[PDB]
């Protein structure tokens, strides 16, 4: 945003994926509601 230039309130996160097995729980509609990390 130019007023030079000005930046508003913002923040973002960066996480990296890893290969691991999860236990996914599908509900009645078919929507994932919970998961378990088998190696936590």
């Amino acid at each position: 945003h130019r007023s030079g230039w000005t930046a508003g309130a913002a923040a973002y996160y960066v996480g990296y994926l890893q290969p691991r097995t999860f236990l996914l729980k599908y509900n009645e509609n078919g929507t994932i509601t919970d998961a378990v990390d088998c190696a936590l």
Binding site: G4, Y13, G15, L17, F22, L23, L24, K25, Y26, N27, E28, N29, G30, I32, A35
Partner: protein, 36 residues
């Protein structure tokens, strides 16, 4: 066109807890009331 930016304030990267975020549907197969 591009402009060098030097008004940056140097700061080391921070860290925070991920909790239980980042889970996505692995595939398009529908499933209901199962544990997979």
């Amino acid at each position: 066109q591009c402009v060098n930016l030097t008004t940056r304030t140097q700061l080391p990267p921070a860290y925070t807890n991920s909790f239980t975020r980042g889970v996505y549907y692995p595939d398009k197969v529908f499933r209901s009331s199962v544990l997979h």
